[model samples]
Target chain A: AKVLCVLYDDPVDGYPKTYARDDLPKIDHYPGGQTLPTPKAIDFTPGQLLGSVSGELGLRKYLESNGHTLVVTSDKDGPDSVFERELVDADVVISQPFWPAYLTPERIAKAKNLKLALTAGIGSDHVDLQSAIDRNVTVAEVTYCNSISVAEHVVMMILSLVRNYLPSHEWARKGGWNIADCVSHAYDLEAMHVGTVAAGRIGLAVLRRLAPFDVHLHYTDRHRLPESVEKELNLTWHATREDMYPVCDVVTLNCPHMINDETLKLFKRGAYIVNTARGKLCDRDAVARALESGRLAGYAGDVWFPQPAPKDHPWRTMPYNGMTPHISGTTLTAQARYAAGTREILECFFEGRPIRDEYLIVQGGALA
Target chain B: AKVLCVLYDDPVDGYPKTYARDDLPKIDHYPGGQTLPTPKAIDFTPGQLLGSVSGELGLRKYLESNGHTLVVTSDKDGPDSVFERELVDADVVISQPFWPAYLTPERIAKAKNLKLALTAGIGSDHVDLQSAIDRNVTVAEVTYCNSISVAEHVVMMILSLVRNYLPSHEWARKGGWNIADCVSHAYDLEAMHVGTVAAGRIGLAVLRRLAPFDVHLHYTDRHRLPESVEKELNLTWHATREDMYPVCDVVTLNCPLHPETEHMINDETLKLFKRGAYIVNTARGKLCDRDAVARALESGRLAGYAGDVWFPQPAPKDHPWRTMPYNGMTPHISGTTLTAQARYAAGTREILECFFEGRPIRDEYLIVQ
Candidate 1:
């Protein structure tokens, strides 16, 4: 069996000679009491850089020792790219949401030997799910692995935007102490209405993290959260995203949508929008325009329409934006869990055992 | 009565012609159920900038209408500045923690008619308390007016440092989708053991705000929090600041600066901290030895250092902290947000009303008598 993995490029300075910290703090369980990844064992340190090309998601030793050929690369773009060339014969393809190896229908059609499409982190949107179902390729992800990580990023961006932290820090970085300038747009997140588009794993975790900040929590989702959860978090449920929009001071796109021109109009003036789900969910030009016209005070998220968003992407230089390079879910702590979970799934797969039901996104030619 | 206020300069681009939002989200009460400021009447808008020189803390109209004199200025530095010149005959001196009118012992000794030293915002550290005590001048502050505001800033800085938000934003701004560059230093704030130097108003509020993040909470204060409070927050109480240093991934200074606390995070304590630990000091810059912090960052002993406080207002352009690595410093504007400004200004007015009407100020607002 052959496993082809695509990961992001290493640091420009090179793979880290040393990490920022010696070790990661032990996180026994995820926020909802989900156990940490139960891999037989891990080949990498918890704090090591395992989500990059050379890092190999810490799968090389295990796969090789088990007599499976493993290939890894950061060059995953274009028809001539290594990932596509290798995909033709790969039995299992592993990719990360941060630097995805898009397994489009055409690529899936060509990969006659491919049996599994694995997402090292949570989201599996990079792989054409419908195509995976049509092709009968098992599609799975390490669910909840980075939900809390992205939730932390959501809260971070929320506070960063409201507090005007990025520009304010710039003032401290450069030679100025412009108090009034730093704070003119700064505000407290407390008392503001903050809503999530969906109350799924990431959204619910975000709500839990923000509850203590004293913000009003609101959500709109296909599935209603338990009544007890609503009461406990003091959440206000909206029937639709439109109903929640006009009332929210800050809107986070958690579960994922097309936030086009018409949809953008529903947000309150100067509303903040944070999208960590999928970049294509937002119309890039509409979001840019909203920010330009002051309809949206800030737009922040790690996801972009295209992975490796072109250097000229408007969001890169958009005023009042807090976007990062699709890195929220790939933090060192998150990378550790997701990498271990990936190992766990692979161990189960090669041994002819069933993958964890929750990890299955599309299996047996249907959505799991 | 005469009221003199010293505030920071107006915005460099000029006071905002328009605010980012139409209005602030109204907060009825503080976290501990303390009611919002209750002055007889307010003379300015809630979202208006009231902490700047031209803003005048929204105190001029009230003072003038009450037959009192009002002098406000941003030229507060030096012995020859407006603050010192106005102190001689001023019956009440109004200042803010953000742009303090430092009342030195010499200044306090020279002000023969000074009756009240009022802080428009929290922290009375700028005043020479012993001198005020000697002169029988009442020193008070709008306590709790912006504790939550500062607390929010502390949490923001914590996440910013841990997740490398500032530098990551730079990558976005510079058109580099460098995920490795961004996440190399980024980590979740979730499992880290975070400790506060003192769990007072701002400290306790920070602990509360951070509770939901699922980090282990620790604090070392002169007064131990109640058992019920500790249990509710799952707080770990340390007897001394020394004891909390090694165990914490992040150490936040939220205690007031005093003789014993000044330079508390100096060379010795920095050595005790886990290498690559983060220190956030929103309380007072003097709480840290500026050079020591810079050295720690340089040596990689500290992963990040952030706070809004500085030893001096309008920290010198060359202040090392302004250029330190991984710092998230903002000019002490945390507690002076327009939202906080409205509350503190109203609280200041409430204090003034009591002083002029011969009514005792709220006991919580009084620091020294």
Candidate 2:
């Protein structure tokens, strides 16, 4: 069996000489009491960088020992790249959400021997799900692997935007004690209306985290949360995304979709938007325009269109943006879990066993 | 009666022509059911910036209508400054913690008619408490006025430092999609041990805000929180600041500055912290040994240092903290937000009304009466 893995480039400074901390903390279980990834064995240290090309996701030794040929590359763009060239005969394809190898219909069609498309971390949007369904490709993601990581990033972005922290930090870094300038755009998260586009694993975690901040919480989703959860968090439900916008001072896109120009008008004036789910969930130009016109006070998220967002990306220079590279779900702590989960899924596949039900995105020619 | 007030300078861009948001959320009361400031009447709008010299804390008209003279100035430094000049004959002196007019013992001796000294916001360490006690002057502050504001800032800085946000934002701003650089030091705050120096209003609020993040909470204070509170937040009570440091992944300063507490985070204490631990101090800059913080960061013994408080307000242009590696320092603006200014200003007015009407100021506001 041939396994093809696409990962981001190694650190510009090369692999770290030493990590910042001596060790990662032991996380026995997730918030909902779900056990951490239960792989048969992990081939790498828990805190090592496993999301980069040279890191190989700690999978090479294990896969090779099982008589599988493994090829890993960061050259994932265009049809001529190593990933595309190697996809022709690969039995399994693996990639991460942070630096995704977009498996389009054409690539899916080319990979004649590919049976499994595994996402090392959560969010399988990078894969063409419809095409996988059509081609009878089994698609699986390490569900809940980095959901808390993304949720943490969402809360961080929300606070950074609302309190105007990025610019404030800039003033401090530049050796200026500009108090008035630092706080002119700042406001407390207290008493503000914050809404999420959906209330799934990531969004619900965000809501729970924010409940202690005394902010009014609201959400819109296809399936509403249980009444007990709504009562506990004091959450308000909206039938649709549009219904959640007008009252929200801060809107976080959790589940996903395109937020174009017309949709931007529904939000409150000077509202903040945080989309850690997917980059194309927002219209790039519309977001830039809203920030320029002061319709949006700020726009921030780790995700960006076309992953490495070209140097000329508007969001890079957009006013009041707190943008960072797409690294939210790939933190060293999160990497450990997803990399381990990837091994577990692979173990299940090679052993002729069933993958975890929650981890399946597409199987047997239908959405799981 | 003459009233002298010292405030910070106006905005560098000049008082805002228009604010970013049209209005602030109306907070009727603070946590713990303490009602908002109940002044006889308020002269300024709730969301206006009233901590600046030009703003006059919305007190000029109110005082002038009652035949009292009011003087407000941002010139508060040195002996020749306007604040010192006005202090000689003033019946009452008012200032804020953000741009405090440090009232030394000598300055107290020079103020012949000073009967009251009021802090528009919390923290009256700028004033010599012993001198106020010796001089028989009534000293008070607007307690809890900006506690939540500072708590919010503390949480913001905690996230910023732990996640390595400032440097990451710089990369995005500089047109570099360096994911590796941005995340090499990034981390999630989940399951980390975080401690606060005190379990006061701001510290307890911080503990509450962080409870849902699933971090272990610890605190050391002269007064332990109620048992209910300790159990509610699953808090660990440390008997001393030294006892808390070695176990903490992050430590925040929330206690007052005093002889026993000054320079608590100096060279000797730095060794007690976990390698790559973070420290956030919104309490007071003097609580940390300035050079020690910088040295720790340079040595990688500390992962990051951040807060809005500085030892000397308007820290010198070459202040080491401003340029320290992995620091998220901001000017002392955490508690002086427009929202906080509104609350503190009203509280100041309430104290003044109580004093002139021969009524006692709120017990919580008095430091030396």
Candidate 3:
């Protein structure tokens, strides 16, 4: 999660170790859309320009020897952007979650030669699926690449908030030993009610892991789990979010879509909310208000409504938030998996063979 | 646990609240041997002198109504210390783990009428047990009172350090959004080897709690657990800490404090620990050498050290550990949770009642009968 983007094309002993394959053609890197301050190692290689996925991370060496083109940049906000300019003639386009190059309907219309869009990590919502289907363009993501990583992060944030760890650690850092002050809000996780929205693979994994903490587990999914599975977890089923929200001391969102503002207001006061699924799943201002008034004891997750949330974004400085830069699913271990998955997809595309059906989200003029 | 010498009292609002009975005599409170700077609440009322325990926690009313006496004072280190002066004719004495009033052999010789020594919480080591035995004075503590609380704290410290939480929280507080910086050193505990020095009640409880984390569990204790118990926890046994240190990424001290364990984690023994390992001590502060701990954190020989106890109570403000690179030190209150306080207070009253009625005390409560 720490250092995701690395540049491999620096001078010898430089930051990224690159290969000198003379035959390699041009490859464009459209990393995410933020301009972080310099000198921070995390911002050393800006995501949009030479982001880890398009920069070094094993891809450049392999692609260069194979004579491939690579282009990378952060200028993706306009129609006249470099991403738009490159897409018209590019043979293959690589997209990532954190710094997605939005593939709008108009861009897909102009991309006459576009045949495939490879998502280096899970979730391909950045691309217009309808446009891809109409263009016979294929869209695929590296599924399961970061399920475990994100699940672990969700659990960490849950405990961090429940234990009032942030302020307690602050007390320790500032050389204060007032145990009474630090513990006024601190609490044990035992006997608390925990819930997760949309119990998919990652959701179920989180539920399984949290089972040992002696919390009351609850979940809501359109696809109800097996009765045996529910019984084993001591899980209570909620048919709707309305029923679940009031019952939980903590709730983690793992659904496919974001929540509405009105629905966000329905959350019980002082309940904790976690969103590892999508930042769009939450109403940013609504969450901010909830946190300000203590309607929510805390809100944590790596995802945000907008990737590379502008420096002025409200959540960055929100007092009770534990937000990171959408890096929950981008751990180093996850990076290796997605990179390997990306290479495999590129190999299949070049061979003119069928990509794995499970990876495809949209293809062949229809939603797959 | 801070001075938890609870006087049997209660309130419509809470505990240590009491009544005033004319029949009750005066009992002296020799709070501790340190003069902590105040405005610090712990020092308010100067513990043992009707400090937070009797003052804020409500002890005076209870002791008065119960026909007992409690005299508290901040001075416990001198010849005229109220604790020493009171023990000359005192029938019962109460002690707490923190701000311990050491009952040395000389004090025992002076306390001719001291028939009972009551510990509000665990660990009766501050008392000279041999002298107490020779003089026929009984010493007893509330066993298992705060063991669960300390075990839970051990788990919290392990996770806080392993997750690299302290720095990450600082990043969030300072408005930095560098996930990379935060997670670079952060790691998952699932793949790490976690060991406990002694598999006593607290140690085994920690293992049970950590059972869900999926870490490789190891333990070294003078007494090993049964095969089925070990098998159930998927635990491996080590006969000695020397054999366990290298294999552990995180090691916790849960053993009793003894001469052999003094500075047990000194330089020579610390060399055996895996580099960048984590050490947690809730048992006692003397278990690890202080300067060695400081050097280990500075040289990156250790990732972090967290504990509740200190070699000295209310460690000096300039204590090296206070400014150590990666530490999570708190005043020893892990065992004095509000819940544990209630239990120990209950145990204290039960012992007092047994003594007053001239009945046999519970076998588990006897230290030197």
Best by TM-score: 1
Per-model TM-score, in order, reads 0.97, 0.96, 0.76
- Name the runs in model 2 displaced over 4 angstroms: A256-260
Q: State which candidate has the highest DockQ.
A: 1
* TM-score of candidate 1 relative to the true fold: 0.97
Candidate 2 per-residue lDDT over residues A28-143, each given as its tens digit: 78766777888999999877888888889999999999999999999988988999999999989999987788889999999899899999998687899999999998999888
Q: Write the per-residue lDDT of candidate 1 for residues B112-192, one digit (tens) a residue.
A: 899999999886778989999999999998888888888989999999899988888888888897888898898999979
Segments in model 1 whose C-alpha atoms lie over 4 Å from true places: none
Native contacts, share recovered per candidate? 0.71, 0.58, 0.10
Clashes of 2: 0
Give the CAPRI class of candidate 3.
Answer: incorrect
lDDT of 3 by residue, B149-261 (tens): 57767777787676665665555556555554554455555546899988876888788767766678999998888899899989989988899999888999986778998
Error of 1 at B217 (Å): 1.5
Cα deviation at B304, candidate 2, in Å, is 1.3
Query: What interface RMSD does each of the candidate structures achieve?
Result: 1.2, 1.3, 11.7
Global lDDT of model 2? 0.88
Q: Which 10 successive residues of model 3 chain B have the least lDDT summed?
A: B21-30
lDDT of 1: 0.89
RMSD of each: 1.8, 1.9, 10.3
